[PDB]
Amino acid sequence: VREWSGINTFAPATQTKLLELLGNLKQEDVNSLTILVMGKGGVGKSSTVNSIIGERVVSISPFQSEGPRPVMVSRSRAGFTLNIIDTPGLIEGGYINDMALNIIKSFLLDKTIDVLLYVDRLDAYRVDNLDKLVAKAITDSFGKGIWNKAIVALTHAQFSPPDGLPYDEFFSKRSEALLQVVRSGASLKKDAQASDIPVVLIENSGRCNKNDSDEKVLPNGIAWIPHLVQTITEVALNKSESIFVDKNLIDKLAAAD
Amino acid sequence: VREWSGINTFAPATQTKLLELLGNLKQEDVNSLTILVMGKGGVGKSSTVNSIIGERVVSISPFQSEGPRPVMVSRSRAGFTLNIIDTPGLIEGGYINDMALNIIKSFLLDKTIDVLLYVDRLDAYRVDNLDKLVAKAITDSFGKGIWNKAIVALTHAQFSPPDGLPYDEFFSKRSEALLQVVRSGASLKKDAQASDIPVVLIENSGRCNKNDSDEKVLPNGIAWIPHLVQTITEVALNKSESIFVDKNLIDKLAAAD
Numbered sequence: 001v002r003e004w005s006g007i008n009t010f011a012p013a014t015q016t017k018l019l020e021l022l023g024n025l026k027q028e029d030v031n032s033l034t035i036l037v038m039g040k041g042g043v044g045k046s047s048t049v050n051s052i053i054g055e056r057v058v059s060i061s062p063f064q065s066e067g068p069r070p071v072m073v074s075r076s077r078a079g080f081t082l083n084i085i086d087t088p089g090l091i092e093g094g095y096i097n098d099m100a101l102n103i104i105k106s107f108l109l110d111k112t113i114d115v116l117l118y119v120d121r122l123d124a125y126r127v128d129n130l131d132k133l134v135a136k137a138i139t140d141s142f143g144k145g146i147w148n149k150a151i152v153a154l155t156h157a158q159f160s161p162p163d164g165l166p167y168d169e170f171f172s173k174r175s176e177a178l179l180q181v182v183r184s185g186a187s188l189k190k191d192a193q194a195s196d197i198p199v200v201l202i203e204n205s206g207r208c209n210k211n212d213s214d215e216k217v218l219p220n221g222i223a224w225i226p227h228l229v230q231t232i233t234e235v236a237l238n239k240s241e242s243i244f245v246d247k248n249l250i251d252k253l254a255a256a257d
Numbered sequence: 258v259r260e261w262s263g264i265n266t267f268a269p270a271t272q273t274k275l276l277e278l279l280g281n282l283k284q285e286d287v288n289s290l291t292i293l294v295m296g297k298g299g300v301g302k303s304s305t306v307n308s309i310i311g312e313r314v315v316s317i318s319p320f321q322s323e324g325p326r327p328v329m330v331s332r333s334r335a336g337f338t339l340n341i342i343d344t345p346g347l348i349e350g351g352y353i354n355d356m357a358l359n360i361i362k363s364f365l366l367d368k369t370i371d372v373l374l375y376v377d378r379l380d381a382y383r384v385d386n387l388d389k390l391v392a393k394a395i396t397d398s399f400g401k402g403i404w405n406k407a408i409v410a411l412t413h414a415q416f417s418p419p420d421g422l423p424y425d426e427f428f429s430k431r432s433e434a435l436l437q438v439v440r441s442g443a444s445l446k447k448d449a450q451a452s453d454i455p456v457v458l459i460e461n462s463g464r465c466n467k468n469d470s471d472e473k474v475l476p477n478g479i480a481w482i483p484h485l486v487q488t489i490t491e492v493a494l495n496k497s498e499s500i501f502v503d504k505n506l507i508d509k510l511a512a513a514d
């Protein structure tokens with residue numbers, strides 16, 4: 001119900017793009033949208049939430065571990081309401097943190113997931129079963145259908161690849177390596193439209209470079225914030241159904257042994 | 258037996274410091290030194306090896322996983338011989354890679370570990386049992402005594418801490434968080450001299466800033482290369498014994514159930 005005043009922190013050019021995207025939503029009778037942010041710990045999930053809202057609404061720690069309770073931030077602008085749910089990492093010690101996973105499930109009880117934002121770091125060089133277990137955990141808790149509404153977001157995008165490797169090439173290799181394990185973890189068929197998960201780049205840093213319109217751009221010259229909301233809008237408006245979470249859904253999914 | 262020509266890649270000021278340290282070693286009748294580089298995958302172990310040797314002697318991949326075979330690089334200068342053993346990460350999928358761990362053990366068979374270089378990234382924000390299992394694995398394979406010869410090295414030191422947090426403060430928090438799990442994994446007593454593990458900073462990047470002497474310095478104004486070799490020299494010259502690895506050692510350690 002609180003005004004999305006945080007938009008006033010974005011460069012004017014970006015604000016106009018975002019307001020236009022919210023317009024397209026209300027145009028399609030989409031008056032609100034719930035985005036669920038999930039992934040491992042320390043990848044910049046809550047920092048992404050602050051960047052999107054435009055204010056320090058959630059806690060971020062470069063040392064201490066995340067809190068256990070999920071948090072939903074809600075703001076409104078021009079009749080549209082954005083709801084974003086920040087959550088604690090799902091992995092710890094090498095296994096799926098069942099306490100964090102279930103507390104998230106309880107929090108989503110009676111809520112509708114319109115967009116799944118899977119977060120990880122761009123500047124990472126390895127991928128293993130740990131990433132696969134996160135994707136699997138998500139599927140087991142909400143159904144493979146959630147992937148039709150998924151977007152993978154890579155943080156720390158203001159990166160300079162080592163060995164003078166082209167930014168575009170590093171991004172390509174990194175994305176492919178991560179989509180592979182995610183697709184495997186979620187048991188998604190390579191041909192299914194659901195495996196076709198979009199990847200976006202994110203730089204939450206305040207030192208992020210900017211274009212002549214004062215917009216935060218990436219090394220590839222793209223204003224990541226407008227692009228992010230654009231992707232979110234397109235995924236939300238796709239023909240797939242949002243995921244309504246209720247006990248029935250949770251039970252029917254737990255039934256699968 | 259090959260000349261350490263790679264020293265010619267270091268700034269003159271650094272070369273003189275390093276040559277002086279090698280002199281102190283031969284002064285103490287220490288004609289050779291074997292450094293064992295270990296840690297998780299993708300933290301910059303082999304990149305550290307190239308920086309120390311001063312040439313692309315080992316493989317580095319920002320995507321593909323490390324090779325399975327350990328590699329020892331040997332170079333000589335002024336009668337001193339440096340032997341450095343690069344190894345594959347010990348963790349994978351959340352568990353200790355028993356194949357990589359044992360292949361390393363076979364490689365060290367009949368070798369003497371003078372310095373243990375435990376490698377990890379500076380720019381990481383979480384620490385869990387995974388880091389503890391690596392430290393434990395090391396202890397279980399060679400004995401808690403190896404820690405008397407250990408040094409923890411944090412890569413990506415050319416880092417700008419988020420939230421405008423002081424570099425020195427980030428380094429402090431990060432080191433303490435990592436030493437904690439390592440000390441726990443190795444079952445080291447907080448008062449024992451063995452728990453007093455030194456931490457050094459490393460920036461393998463070619464974009465690393467430099468001082469007026471052309472030396473690669475860190476955000477704290479320290480030439481990390483000379484400092485690194487200095488620490489290695491001091492640890493090697495401490496009163497503790499190096500670890501001679503033989504079947505007997507391996508067996509006696511495996512005996513402990």
Ligand SMILES: Nc1nc2c(ncn2[C@@H]2O[C@H](COP(=O)(O)OP(=O)(O)O)[C@@H](O)[C@H]2O)c(=O)[nH]1
Pocket residue numbers: 040041042043044045046047048059060061062066089155156157202203204205382419420
């Ligand atoms: N440079 C950079 N730092 C970031 C980025 N995202 C997150 N951070 C830092 O990464 C740390 C962890 O962020 P946080 O949002 O708490 O991660 P989480 O635990 O997954 O929610 C914090 O110190 C953030 O300042 C990013 O995109 N770039």
Ligand SMILES: Nc1nc2c(ncn2[C@@H]2O[C@H](COP(=O)(O)OP(=O)(O)O)[C@@H](O)[C@H]2O)c(=O)[nH]1
Pocket residue numbers: 125162163297298299300301302303304305316317318319323346412413414459460461462
């Ligand atoms: N900026 C930066 N990149 C580094 C640093 N050390 C390693 N790298 C990069 O990190 C990746 C992994 O390095 P590598 O030595 O192969 O790690 P390992 O698998 O643990 O041996 C490579 O792309 C290196 O270029 C470092 O200190 N700073």
Ligand SMILES: [Mg+2]
Pocket residue numbers: 042045046047059060066087088089
């Ligand atoms: Mg968080």
Ligand SMILES: [Mg+2]
Pocket residue numbers: 299302303304316317323344345346
């Ligand atoms: Mg390596």
